[PDB]
Amino acid sequence: AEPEHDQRKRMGLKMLLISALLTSLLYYMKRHKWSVLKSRKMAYRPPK
Amino acid sequence: AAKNVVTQFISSLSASADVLALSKIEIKLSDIPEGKNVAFKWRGKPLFVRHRTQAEINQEAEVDVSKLRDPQHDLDRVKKPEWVILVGVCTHLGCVPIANSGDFGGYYCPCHGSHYDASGRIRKGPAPYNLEVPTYQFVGDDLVVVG
Amino acid sequence: FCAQGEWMRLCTSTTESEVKRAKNHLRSAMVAQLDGTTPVCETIGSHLLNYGRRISLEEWDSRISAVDARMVRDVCSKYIYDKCPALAAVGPIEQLLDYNRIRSGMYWI
Amino acid sequence: GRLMDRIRKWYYNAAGFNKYGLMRDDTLYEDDDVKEALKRLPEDLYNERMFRIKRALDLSLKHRILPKEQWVKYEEDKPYLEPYLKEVIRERLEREAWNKK
Amino acid sequence: MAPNIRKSHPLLKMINNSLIDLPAPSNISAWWNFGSLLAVCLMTQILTGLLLAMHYTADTSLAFSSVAHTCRNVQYGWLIRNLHANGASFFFICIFLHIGRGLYYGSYLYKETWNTGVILLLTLMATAFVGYVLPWGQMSFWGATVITNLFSAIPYIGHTLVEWAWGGFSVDNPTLTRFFALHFLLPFAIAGITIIHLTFLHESGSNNPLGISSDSDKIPFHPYYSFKDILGLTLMLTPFLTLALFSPNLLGDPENFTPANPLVTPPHIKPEWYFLFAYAILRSIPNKLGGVLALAASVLILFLIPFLHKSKQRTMTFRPLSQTLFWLLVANLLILTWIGSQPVEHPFIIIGQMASLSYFTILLILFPTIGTLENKMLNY
Amino acid sequence: APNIRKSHPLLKMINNSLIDLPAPSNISAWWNFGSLLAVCLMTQILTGLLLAMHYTADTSLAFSSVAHTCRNVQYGWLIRNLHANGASFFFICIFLHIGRGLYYGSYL
Amino acid sequence: WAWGGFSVDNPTLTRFFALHFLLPFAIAGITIIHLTFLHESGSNNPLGISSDSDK
Amino acid sequence: IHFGNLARVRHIITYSLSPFEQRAIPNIFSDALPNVWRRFSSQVFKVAPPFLGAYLLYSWGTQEFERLKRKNPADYENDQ
Amino acid sequence: ALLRQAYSALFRRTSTFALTVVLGAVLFERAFDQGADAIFEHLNEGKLWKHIKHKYEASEE
Numbered sequence A: 001a002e003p004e005h006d007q008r009k010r011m012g013l014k015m016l017l018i019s020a021l022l023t024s025l026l027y028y029m030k031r032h033k034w035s036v037l038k039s040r041k042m043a044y045r046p047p048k
Numbered sequence B: 001a002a003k004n005v006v007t008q009f010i011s012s013l014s015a016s017a018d019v020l021a022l023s024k025i026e027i028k029l030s031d032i033p034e035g036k037n038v039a040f041k042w043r044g045k046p047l048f049v050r051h052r053t054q055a056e057i058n059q060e061a062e063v064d065v066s067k068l069r070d071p072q073h074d075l076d077r078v079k080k081p082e083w084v085i086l087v088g089v090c091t092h093l094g095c096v097p098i099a100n101s102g103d104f105g106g107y108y109c110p111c112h113g114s115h116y117d118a119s120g121r122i123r124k125g126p127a128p129y130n131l132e133v134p135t136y137q138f139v140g141d142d143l144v145v146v147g
Numbered sequence C: 001f002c003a004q005g006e007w008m009r010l011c012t013s014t015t016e017s018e019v020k021r022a023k024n025h026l027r028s029a030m031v032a033q034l035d036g037t038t039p040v041c042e043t044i045g046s047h048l049l050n051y052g053r054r055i056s057l058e059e060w061d062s063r064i065s066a067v068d069a070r071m072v073r074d075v076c077s078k079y080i081y082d083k084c085p086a087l088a089a090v091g092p093i094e095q096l097l098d099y100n101r102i103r104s105g106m107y108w109i
Numbered sequence D: 001g002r003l004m005d006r007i008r009k010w011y012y013n014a015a016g017f018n019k020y021g022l023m024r025d026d027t028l029y030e031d032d033d034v035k036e037a038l039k040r041l042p043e044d045l046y047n048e049r050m051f052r053i054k055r056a057l058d059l060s061l062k063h064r065i066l067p068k069e070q071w072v073k074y075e076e077d078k079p080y081l082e083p084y085l086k087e088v089i090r091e092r093l094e095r096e097a098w099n100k101k
Numbered sequence E: 001m002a003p004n005i006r007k008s009h010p011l012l013k014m015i016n017n018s019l020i021d022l023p024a025p026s027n028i029s030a031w032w033n034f035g036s037l038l039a040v041c042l043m044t045q046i047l048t049g050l051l052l053a054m055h056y057t058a059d060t061s062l063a064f065s066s067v068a069h070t071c072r073n074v075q076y077g078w079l080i081r082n083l084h085a086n087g088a089s090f091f092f093i094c095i096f097l098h099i100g101r102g103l104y105y106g107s108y109l110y111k112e113t114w115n116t117g118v119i120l121l122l123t124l125m126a127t128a129f130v131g132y133v134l135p136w137g138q139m140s141f142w143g144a145t146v147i148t149n150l151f152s153a154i155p156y157i158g159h160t161l162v163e164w165a166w167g168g169f170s171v172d173n174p175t176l177t178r179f180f181a182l183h184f185l186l187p188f189a190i191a192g193i194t195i196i197h198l199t200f201l202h203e204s205g206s207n208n209p210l211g212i213s214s215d216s217d218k219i220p221f222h223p224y225y226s227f228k229d230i231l232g233l234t235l236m237l238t239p240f241l242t243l244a245l246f247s248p249n250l251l252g253d254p255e256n257f258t259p260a261n262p263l264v265t266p267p268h269i270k271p272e273w274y275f276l277f278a279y280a281i282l283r284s285i286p287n288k289l290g291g292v293l294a295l296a297a298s299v300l301i302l303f304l305i306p307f308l309h310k311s312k313q314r315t316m317t318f319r320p321l322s323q324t325l326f327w328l329l330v331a332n333l334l335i336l337t338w339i340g341s342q343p344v345e346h347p348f349i350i351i352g353q354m355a356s357l358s359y360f361t362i363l364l365i366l367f368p369t370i371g372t373l374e375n376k377m378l379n380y
Numbered sequence F: 001a002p003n004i005r006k007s008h009p010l011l012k013m014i015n016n017s018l019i020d021l022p023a024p025s026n027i028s029a030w031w032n033f034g035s036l037l038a039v040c041l042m043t044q045i046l047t048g049l050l051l052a053m054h055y056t057a058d059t060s061l062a063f064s065s066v067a068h069t070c071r072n073v074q075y076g077w078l079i080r081n082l083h084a085n086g087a088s089f090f091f092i093c094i095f096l097h098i099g100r101g102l103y104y105g106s107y108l
Numbered sequence G: 001w002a003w004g005g006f007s008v009d010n011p012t013l014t015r016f017f018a019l020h021f022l023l024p025f026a027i028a029g030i031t032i033i034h035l036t037f038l039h040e041s042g043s044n045n046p047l048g049i050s051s052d053s054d055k
Numbered sequence H: 001i002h003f004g005n006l007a008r009v010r011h012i013i014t015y016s017l018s019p020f021e022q023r024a025i026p027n028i029f030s031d032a033l034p035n036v037w038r039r040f041s042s043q044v045f046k047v048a049p050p051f052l053g054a055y056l057l058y059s060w061g062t063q064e065f066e067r068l069k070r071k072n073p074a075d076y077e078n079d080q
Numbered sequence I: 001a002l003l004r005q006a007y008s009a010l011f012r013r014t015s016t017f018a019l020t021v022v023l024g025a026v027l028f029e030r031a032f033d034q035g036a037d038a039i040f041e042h043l044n045e046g047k048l049w050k051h052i053k054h055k056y057e058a059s060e061e
């Protein structure tokens, strides 16, 4: 029914590992850039 | 000019010559004797044309019009009593019946039961309706044109 | 955009022609800082206080003359390239934006 | 009795814009009337609304809210724009009605 | 001309004003990630689709086997086939979250962006419907049959519009060939119309979760959102691949591993998950014609949302009554989806009409009503 | 803006390239091939689709599908003719378009 | 690689049909770019001299 | 040109630090998680309910359907 | 300090960064594949043709 059966699964393994690795890396990077806005502080100083 | 070109193009998508060529089939009633059901090929699906004897047409009248799922007496189905023309497909899940047999002498769908009388009506079985009756008519006491 | 651009040029593609001229400008500059008694006194007070002694124009000039393209590039790279700068903005500054974008202007000529 | 009041004060907390330090009028969708009304606000009320709003946006991106102490209280919410907005609509309805006649 | 070539150049300038120097609210959440996904998703379909079309044969006598030959002989044909077929679902999952997000945050107040959006949905639906027929399996044929036969229910011009679409008297070779053409064509219309979608969008710029002007705080698309979206892409991509690689046929009917047969009706003729809900509404109104209209209305209802907004606020963030009503509706849809997968028998039949009834009520009557009532509770 | 031909995000595009677009008062017939090329293109695509809905891409059926299109499809023969000949019109037009540009230094 | 085998055969025919269906669209797309650059300058004219004086 | 025409803003000051001077994912326990909880809490009673109701309806209708497939002995109690 | 070394030698000059990614990729592939395949075959002992092949591979008829 589906000869690819084995190669398909072996591929799923490779996909998970890489997926795990890449997703973590990209999460860090997303965070690193946004850090600037996430920690940002503001104040309202009218000539009051 | 526009009306024409559009007309031509639009129409290029409707049925082509080869397809219309099988649009309808003409059967010769002379080849079909009484008491013998003859099936032909129409639109890829079996077409039933049985010659009903004066005897079978009787068993027909003896049918409680209000005791059948798809309530219809021969009157509403055919035209010429000695002639019954059905679309050979069980109304349940598209199977092709078997004539002469069954609990009502008509047709029997060996798929889930569905027994049809001599007039092609669902009697005993799962089928919801009765074998379909397609458009047609006659031409000379020997030809019929279904479709 | 253009400004940061010039800094990147300093680190990556300075020309002898540019330094040659830059040096003449800088000389006339140091000299112009000793044009009067107050400005020469300001120099003395400061030099001692900062370098722990006086540095004569004769010296400044010796050092300034040793500077060349290759040198300017190495120094600027060392102090500017890929650094995270400090930014101060005042006024109708809506069009200047994102520290991130500015930080990225700190590399690749 | 004080039913209507109980309800309103309830919904006011239910909504929760005050957790962002916003006044009810800060949350209005800016259609045409509201846009004109905002143009009439005095310089000071305008910059105040502006900060309140920019503050809320920063809280939103941060996925935070203000400490319970800083939450606008039902009875201390200033309907700063309602007065202007109502007139703007009155003026519009005058015109609309007059151009029909 | 201008200092940097990113602003002067007739082309880069376009890339810049829509993916780099473009102003975006500083607070848009993950719900705003589906736009790019939809886009990426679309490129992927077209890419895998072409690769598949280079091995397909649009002929009843060769369709089924061409696909099989592709999986069995073509280098990675099986992979490409999986990706394309599953890619379709990712596409709809994404489009439903995209639509949801818009309803919950009143994005639809951006009328043209909204309307082009409804057209995108409709085109997409047609695209999948014709694509599905291509492998020519039992469900391919019967779905094609069941649904195209509905048009014969339109008065006078019915039986014709139908025999015109089929190119004959039943779904046959002449239908398959024109469906392949259509399936190849529509995705491009989609891409085109998407350019229009984003164009109208850029007139106003993005809306944000608090629904109040974000001019006071805008950030450049890059790197903020270029990174946020790429992260969003990998996050969705994982379940996708996990499904298409570990459980390849989870979402698909086994009946489609049997070559179409006009003389054998499958026991349960149900659609792919993403059409279930509509199939449910269809069967809710017994009467060929009413059911059709009900179906039409189910998706067309989307064009009326913009005019059924009564609130004085844009989003549902600060509208708790609207929020439950909103999640009630979502739940309403899950049920219709479930009903769409069951036979037409009690209790499913009654539950079906209820969910169908509640569906239209919630959007036509409740939402606008609760909205007004809510306005009064703010003393407005 | 006053007239909706300039404000609308779409009509505005149609207007700035086919209605209010500035054109030299003296361009000759050699400047007509651009539009022809364009029209020519829309025609090919249109006839091409109509033909693709009856073609079968298989060595064992290609030749005959085309023949079936000409012999059985309503106006298939016409559509087939138009598409095939349209190809030439296309090239004729493109060569004159190219020539025109070389002779008047449009390539600048 | 282009034939999909060792000679022009079925695998070639099928990929050519796909290509023939696709390219016209690339053409239409690219034509939009063609006209976009064009509109930057506006049309040239037979005398090859600035026509801003008469448009 | 969309940057510089957006809004009339006066008197707001902002301080921010380069990404390289700060931590990417800071205070996971002291700030992060607490809020994740906060958010979950605030919403659960708005979302959860209709889904729960949907479940029951599903469960009922499913079971009720199977019960109607079973036989009722009271149809064969006098079939001798 | 590798981080500093790395930064200086590899990540500073954009040309060397690309070079690092390229040469880094090549090595990563070679290694990653071998490891994955290894994990897969171990998890599947005696099931693959690789394993049973010897029985008919020149040892029959």
Ligand code: HEM
Pocket: E031, E032, E033, E034, E035, E036, E038, E039, E042, E095, E098, E099, E102, E105, E106, E107, E108, E110, E113, E114, E115, E116, E117, E118, E120, E121, E190, E194, E197, E198, E201, E205, E206, E207, E208, E302
């Ligand atoms: C192939 C289909 C579609 C694609 C590729 C697409 C793409 C996009 C993109 C890229 C965005 C901007 C980012 C975002 O906010 O997510 C967007 C926004 C939007 N889309 Fe779509 N969209 C599609 C379908 C639809 C549909 C079906 C609707 C709704 C009927 C729709 C409604 C919207 C609206 C109103 C916005 C504004 C979002 C906001 O509130 O800021 N889109 N879309």
Ligand code: HEM
Pocket: E042, E045, E046, E047, E048, E049, E050, E051, E052, E053, E054, E056, E067, E081, E084, E085, E088, E091, E124, E127, E128, E129, E131, E132, E133, E134, E135, E183, E184, E185, E187, E190
């Ligand atoms: C919006 C993008 C698209 C969607 C939603 C889509 C969807 C589908 C669907 C639902 C199927 C059925 C797959 C199966 O279960 O077997 C399919 C088949 C097919 N599609 Fe697409 N498709 C898209 C684009 C394309 C494009 C652009 C091409 C190529 C021009 C294409 C070519 C094919 C081919 C050859 C088949 C038949 C092979 C098969 O059955 O897998 N598709 N597509």
Ligand code: HEM
Pocket: F030, F031, F032, F033, F034, F035, F037, F038, F041, F094, F097, F098, F101, F104, F105, F106, F107, G027, G031, G034, G035, G038, G042, G043, G044, G045
């Ligand atoms: C499908 C192919 C093409 C289409 C549809 C197209 C379309 C157009 C159109 C509409 C115009 C404006 C009207 C005109 O000047 O004729 C134009 C102008 C132009 N095209 Fe093309 N073109 C095509 C191919 C080419 C080719 C092959 C060349 C030359 C290598 C070319 C060179 C030019 C140039 C330089 C102009 C400027 C005319 C002037 O001097 O004012 N075009 N084209």
Ligand code: HEM
Pocket: F041, F044, F045, F046, F047, F048, F049, F050, F051, F052, F053, F055, F066, F080, F083, F084, F087, F090, G020, G021, G024, G027
């Ligand atoms: C730039 C536009 C196009 C050009 C230059 C073009 C040209 C041609 C040529 C050279 C032929 C051979 C005709 C013959 O002598 O038998 C042909 C065949 C074909 N074209 Fe096109 N074509 C174009 C667009 C299209 C498109 C867009 C489609 C449909 C998506 C298409 C579908 C077909 C089909 C079905 C055939 C085979 C039928 C036949 O042989 O007439 N073509 N085309």
Ligand SMILES: COc1nn(C)c(=O)n1-c1cccc2ccc(C#CC(C)(C)C)cc12
Pocket: E125, E126, E128, E129, E130, E132, E133, E139, E140, E142, E143, E144, E146, E147, E269, E270, E271, E272, E275, E278, E279, E295
């Ligand atoms: C080729 O027919 C189908 N394509 N796809 C993707 C699909 O699910 N079906 C189907 C296969 C089996 C039963 C089906 C019942 C209803 C529909 C539908 C629909 C609209 C467009 C109105 C949403 C499609 C069916």
Ligand SMILES: CCCCCCCCO[C@@H]1O[C@H](CO)[C@@H](O)[C@H](O)[C@H]1O
Pocket: A007, A010, A011, A014, A015, A018, A019, A022, E237
């Ligand atoms: C998120 C992106 C994930 C990409 C994962 C790429 C892994 C594909 O790796 C594949 O493994 C097969 C089994 O050994 C090999 O036969 C293929 O040649 C190889 O490309």
Ligand code: FES
Pocket: B090, B091, B092, B093, B094, B095, B109, B110, B111, B112, B113, B114, B125, B126, B127
């Ligand atoms: S198909 Fe005839 S009894 Fe079921």
